[PDB]
């Protein structure tokens, strides 16, 4: 029901569709990558990459997860 903000992920005071905890560091800034149901892995990853300033090497790591978010290899897997 579109009444309570339970049908959305409120991270750092921002509502988004899906969020991925980027545990790249222990004991510091808890990076959380926000993804919407209408974006492209490399695009959304790049947006966050330059949002909190992250090294391009992490782009591949985060993109891989977003790619299967709406694919079906290990996350939403099923009938091929």
């Amino acid at each position: 029901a579109n009444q309570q903000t339970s049908g959305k992920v409120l991270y750092e005071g921002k509502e988004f569709d899906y969020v991925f905890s980027i545990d790249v560091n222990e004991g510091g800034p808890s990076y959380k990558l926000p993804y919407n149901t209408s974006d492209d892995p490399w695009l959304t990853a790049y947006n966050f990459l330059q949002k909190n300033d992250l090294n391009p090497m992490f782009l591949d790591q985060v993109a891989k997860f977003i790619i299967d978010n709406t694919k079906g290899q290990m996350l939403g897997l099923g009938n091929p």
């Binding site: 560091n25 222990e26 591949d60 790591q61 996350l75």
Partner: protein, 76 residues
């Protein structure tokens, strides 16, 4: 010591190695258990990738820390 490695899908696996063990041997043990090639296997810790010529004490790895086990995009 044992380290907790987290795969891309969030799979958590514990690897038993020695403090004087190089990351290359650690990768070999993972290639022995799961079978993941040490070449494509990319280990990221604290934002830095673990090199082969490095030991556990090299990166000052904390006992039972979170190691990120991912793959690679560019093959060449």
């Amino acid at each position: 010591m044992q380290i907790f490695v987290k795969t891309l899908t969030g799979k958590t696996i514990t690897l038993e190695v020695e403090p004087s063990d190089t990351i290359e041997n650690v990768k070999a043990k993972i290639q022995d258990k799961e079978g993941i090639p040490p070449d494509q296997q990319r280990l990221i810790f604290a934002g830095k990738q673990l090199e082969d010529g490095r030991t556990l004490s090299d990166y000052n790895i904390q006992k039972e820390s979170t190691l990120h086990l991912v793959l690679r995009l560019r093959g060449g």
